[PDB]
Design an enzyme around this catalytic site. Structure first.
Site, PDB file in Angstrom:
ATOM      1  N   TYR A  96      12.657 -49.623   0.219  1.00 26.74           N
ATOM      2  CA  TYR A  96      13.576 -49.434  -0.924  1.00 26.74           C
ATOM      3  C   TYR A  96      13.837 -50.810  -1.545  1.00 26.74           C
ATOM      4  CZ  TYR A  96      17.933 -48.138  -3.413  1.00 26.74           C
ATOM      5  OH  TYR A  96      18.902 -47.844  -4.337  1.00 26.74           O
ATOM      6  N   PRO A  99      18.980 -55.159  -4.489  1.00 28.52           N
ATOM      7  CA  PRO A  99      19.506 -56.493  -4.391  1.00 28.52           C
ATOM      8  C   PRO A  99      20.081 -56.839  -3.008  1.00 28.52           C
ATOM      9  CG  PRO A  99      20.273 -55.430  -6.392  1.00 28.52           C
ATOM     10  CD  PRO A  99      19.751 -54.328  -5.460  1.00 28.52           C
ATOM     11  N   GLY A 123      15.145 -46.831  -7.061  1.00 30.13           N
ATOM     12  CA  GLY A 123      16.522 -46.424  -7.383  1.00 30.13           C
ATOM     13  C   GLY A 123      16.805 -46.545  -8.859  1.00 30.13           C
ATOM     14  N   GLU A 126      23.333 -46.256 -10.070  1.00 30.85           N
ATOM     15  CA  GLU A 126      23.876 -47.313  -9.217  1.00 30.85           C
ATOM     16  C   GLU A 126      23.078 -47.397  -7.909  1.00 30.85           C
ATOM     17  OE1 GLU A 126      25.792 -49.368 -10.973  1.00 30.85           O
ATOM     18  OE2 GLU A 126      25.543 -47.840 -12.524  1.00 30.85           O
ATOM     19  N   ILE A 143      13.564 -58.488  -5.053  1.00 30.13           N
ATOM     20  CA  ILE A 143      12.651 -59.459  -5.714  1.00 30.13           C
ATOM     21  C   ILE A 143      13.435 -60.710  -6.127  1.00 30.13           C
ATOM     22  CG2 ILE A 143      10.943 -57.749  -6.355  1.00 30.13           C
ATOM     23  CD1 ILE A 143      11.979 -58.275  -9.296  1.00 30.13           C
ATOM     24  N   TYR A 146      19.398 -60.707  -8.787  1.00 28.88           N
ATOM     25  CA  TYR A 146      19.753 -60.167 -10.119  1.00 28.88           C
ATOM     26  C   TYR A 146      19.617 -58.652 -10.069  1.00 28.88           C
ATOM     27  CZ  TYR A 146      14.750 -61.252 -10.122  1.00 28.88           C
ATOM     28  OH  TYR A 146      13.467 -61.390  -9.648  1.00 28.88           O
ATOM     29  N   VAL A 147      20.296 -57.975 -10.978  1.00 30.54           N
ATOM     30  CA  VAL A 147      20.347 -56.497 -11.054  1.00 30.54           C
ATOM     31  C   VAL A 147      19.559 -56.042 -12.260  1.00 30.54           C
ATOM     32  CG1 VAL A 147      21.834 -54.471 -11.177  1.00 30.54           C
ATOM     33  CG2 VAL A 147      22.560 -56.499  -9.849  1.00 30.54           C
ATOM     34  N   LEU A 148      18.677 -55.067 -12.005  1.00 31.22           N
ATOM     35  CA  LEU A 148      17.856 -54.424 -13.039  1.00 31.22           C
ATOM     36  C   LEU A 148      18.318 -52.985 -13.226  1.00 31.22           C
ATOM     37  CD1 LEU A 148      14.498 -56.051 -12.019  1.00 31.22           C
ATOM     38  CD2 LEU A 148      16.226 -56.940 -13.531  1.00 31.22           C
ATOM     39  N   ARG A 164      -2.764 -59.259  -4.922  1.00 35.73           N
ATOM     40  CA  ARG A 164      -3.471 -60.529  -5.015  1.00 35.73           C
ATOM     41  C   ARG A 164      -4.051 -60.903  -3.647  1.00 35.73           C
ATOM     42  NH1 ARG A 164      -1.304 -64.811  -5.495  1.00 35.73           N
ATOM     43  NH2 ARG A 164      -2.823 -66.002  -6.721  1.00 35.73           N
ATOM     44  N   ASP A 172      -4.875 -70.738  -2.673  1.00 34.45           N
ATOM     45  CA  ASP A 172      -4.483 -71.306  -4.000  1.00 34.45           C
ATOM     46  C   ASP A 172      -3.116 -70.796  -4.529  1.00 34.45           C
ATOM     47  OD1 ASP A 172      -6.902 -72.692  -3.802  1.00 34.45           O
ATOM     48  OD2 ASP A 172      -8.026 -71.038  -4.720  1.00 34.45           O
TER      49      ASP A 172
END
Ligand SMILES: NCc1cccc(CNc2ccc(C(N)=O)cn2)c1
Ligand SMILES: NCc1cccc(CNc2ccc(C(N)=O)cn2)c1
Lengths: 248, 248
Positions: A96, A99, A123, A126, A143, A146-148, A164, A172
């Site tokens: 999941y 934050p 999610g 809220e 990640i 901050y809140v998205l 990747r 690299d």
């Protein structure tokens, strides 16, 4: 699945999202899009909306104790998660994106990349009921602090970052645990700024040492806490000291 | 532009990207999609490919001094940046998303949100020529310590994060500089897990204090360095001490 591209380390990523079309941004374009076409990466989406039974396909629900915001409705979300888990079969880790999760960094990306199968729960509102964490989620990851508006962009960021590390996806990454050295392409002079002559020299060892010195210098100046995480080589200790003496 | 929705604080975001279609993930869906339809947020994309003149529309170029990877070709990228800047007129801050950038956190999101106009430059390949940083870029920002295939996902993460701070976009972001408290929706019992009775109590002050205590407890257990950033209120000091005593 069929094709010629080597795919021993291929990854399957199940995704639970109310906006599965967002994931076209990774599955249709660029390096990630190529990974998908070549069967190195598979992204399969379940939408909680498809697991509703009411006339208006309700996917949100009110928080116990009040508040401004809604939560994801439990039944549609839980049913979607269970369908993903049945599709994945054994060994799928459920993530999941929140934050309050473990902070993602490149070391964590490489740990996640060891999983052949992931399920990423996105999610909205809220977020999701605490008890679904205990019953359905293996790990929470963030990640960044901050809140998205939803876990879709976090989920796509994790997919791209892990992709990747799938052999064959690239041609690299923070070489040496350090920031990138400056790099340059044509033209030789840009608004009166010249390419450092060492990079035109054709001296492969001189270029390697200049790039390492510049990486150590940039990491020291911008992100000195990143150097504290490292046990520098003898060569790195000497190039950093040269860069610090030149700076002073 | 016309409409009824209050948009005094509207934001314009210019974007430079080889894959402008990725940005549909934010401009077509959810809260960000609504922001766009209501003229609170405008996302305008320039593609360096459109600024090429060669038959094959070349947008990459070789690094001086060699290496495995390519860089963005300077001329198409610079021309796209200049076109965005002319469209934006005065006051537009130019941002490059890079792992060597300032680390984004919610405080930084709110600083960025003060700009009415941003231009976001999306690097692909190994990134862009150092001299374009000096000549074109106002600030570099990172969404986190990991490498992605391009700056598109970072750019979309920053757009989404800043959009939340545009008045009217939302209907509480890390309330108090703390992690979220547990939250719950129906049903009252889930796989033998009950909703804490305080949240059913209808006692607004008891619920507020329980949520604050739980936020302080979660932040202490998962991210104790976040508490060091704070000057806790008297009430927060007491609830944290209660949570720490209960834990021990
Ligand atoms: N109440 C905030 C909240 C809690 C859980 C999930 C979301 C959805 N949005 C997200 C999810 C992850 C991240 C992240 N930093 O990884 C950011 N925003 C929101
Ligand atoms: N050589 C790595 C490199 C340098 C600049 C730009 C990119 C493109 N990809 C990105 C950009 C930002 C972020 C970030 N963490 O904000 C991650 N990946 C790559």
């Amino acid at each position: 699945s069929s094709g010629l591209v080597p795919r021993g380390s291929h990854m399957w990523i199940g995704v639970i999202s109310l906006f599965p079309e967002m994931f076209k941004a990774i599955t249709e374009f660029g390096v990630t899009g190529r990974a998908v076409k070549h069967n190195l990466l598979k992204v399969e989406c379940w939408n909680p909306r498809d697991f509703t039974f009411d006339k208006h396909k309700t996917v949100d629900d009110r928080p116990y104790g009040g508040g401004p915001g809604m939560l994801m409705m439990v039944q549609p979300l839980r049913d979607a998660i269970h369908t993903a888990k049945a599709a994945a079969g054994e060994g799928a880790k459920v993530i999941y994106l929140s934050p309050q999760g473990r902070k993602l960094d490149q070391g964590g990306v490489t740990e996640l990349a060891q999983n052949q199968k992931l399920i990423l729960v996105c999610g909205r509102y809220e977020g999701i009921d605490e008890r679904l964490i205990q019953t359905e989620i293996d790990e929470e990851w963030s990640i960044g602090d901050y809140v998205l508006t939803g876990g879709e962009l976090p989920a796509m960021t994790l997919i791209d970052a892990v992709a990747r590390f799938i052999p064959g996806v690239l041609g690299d990454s923070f070489a040496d645990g350090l920031l990138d050295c400056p790099h340059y392409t044509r033209p030789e002079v840009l608004e009166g700024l010249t390419v450092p002559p060492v990079l035109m020299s054709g001296h492969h060892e001189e270029i390697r040492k200049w790039r390492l010195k510049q990486s150590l210098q940039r990491t020291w100046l911008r992100r000195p806490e990143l150097l504290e995480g490292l046990a520098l080589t003898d060569e790195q200790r000497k190039l950093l000291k040269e860069a610090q003496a030149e700076h002073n």
